[PDB]
Amino acid sequence: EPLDVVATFSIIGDFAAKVGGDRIRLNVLVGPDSDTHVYEPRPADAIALAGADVVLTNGLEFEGFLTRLIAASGTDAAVATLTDGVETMEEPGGGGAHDPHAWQAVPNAKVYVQNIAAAFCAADAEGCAAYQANAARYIGELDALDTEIRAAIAALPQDRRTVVVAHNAFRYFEAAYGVHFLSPQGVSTESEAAAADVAGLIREIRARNASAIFAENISDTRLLEQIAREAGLPLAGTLYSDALSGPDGPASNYIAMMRHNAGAIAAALAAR
Ligand SMILES: [Zn+2]
């Protein structure tokens, strides 16, 4: 009777719970504090897909395992790519690959949400008015959030807008909001460290007068702690990049995740 939905990872799982309410049964593959770039699907994940009516995915090559997992599971679920209709950004490096981290700009989260609603509308026409009224309610909360983030940032001094994080995961926040981010890893956490290039990072840190270093919830902290040491900059806290916190963390849903991040960034930038 309820719609069987599978979401690839936590951030889009939260969006699904918002649009779908009581009418869906939700399963999430990659969970809180876990990293989708390196996730290897387990056999339990194939069982989940096999029963789904709807599978929700970021797309943009975020989930390198999906298409395999789809064929292994034999699922007939319809698959919705929630970045459909988002203004995407190309990866810096490559490779006409796209940067998958589109949810870091709240306007794009509105789109993910619209696509969830459409997907549920296609699978359960009887529920469609309810899916859309949930989406519209939530989209109103996202619009207020967007306003608050832009406002807080645009206030801050033009000359102190840079922070250091773990991977290159906030380019859409930069584009929406005007905060510049450096990191030792690229767009994906698949690679390494090339501690052979912290001295490169550090030099860019000095040239840009970066205000602070942040850990990320998906990643181990040691290099960040060391970069902090060598740059003489505080380790200011933890940002939530590609996953929610668990419950009882400060980022257990998307809106809370963004308010945390934006508040932590602003405090650090204003510290100087
Ligand atoms: Zn990432």
Class (C level, CATH) for 145-272: alpha beta
Count Cβ atoms below 10 Å from residue 107 Cβ, excluding itself: 14
Closest by alpha carbon to 257, among 108, 106, 112, 136? 106
Domain topology for 1-142: Rossmann fold (3.40.50)
- Can you tell me which residue has the tokens 């929700």? 56
Residue type at 143? D
Q: Is 180 labelled a binding residue?
A: no
Q: Determine if residue 167 is labeled as part of a ligand binding site.
A: yes
Whole-angstrom distance, CA of residue 53 vs CA of residue 113: 18
Helices (H), 74-127: 106-123
3-state secondary structure of 59: coil
Q: 252 C-alpha vs ligand 1 centroid, how far in Å?
A: 18
Cα(193) to centroid(ligand 1), Å: 15
37 annotated ligand binder: yes
Backbone angles phi, psi at 51, to 5 degrees: -90, 0
Breaks in the chain after residues, C-to-N cutoff 2.5 Å: none
159 SS3 class: coil
How were these coordinates obtained?
Answer: X-ray
- According to the annotation, is 98 in a ligand binding site? no
* Strand order, beta sheet including 24-30: 24-30, 3-9, 54-57, 78-81
> Across the strands, what pairs with 56?
7, 80
Resolution in units of Å: 2.2
Q: How far is the first Cα of the chain from the last one, in angstroms, to the nearest whole number?
A: 56
Give 123-128 contacts, CB < 8 A, sequence gap 24+.
123/3, 123/53, 123/54, 123/78, 124/3, 124/23, 124/53, 127/3, 127/23
For residue 54, give the nearest of 30, 77, 25 by alpha carbon: 77
Domain ranges of the chain: 1-142, 145-272
Q: Is the dihedral of CA 7, 85, 111, 24 positive or negative?
A: negative
- H-assigned helices in 161-244: 171-177, 198-207, 222-231
Centre of ligand 1 to C-alpha 135, Å, is 26
Q: Is 1-142's fold the same as 145-272's?
A: yes
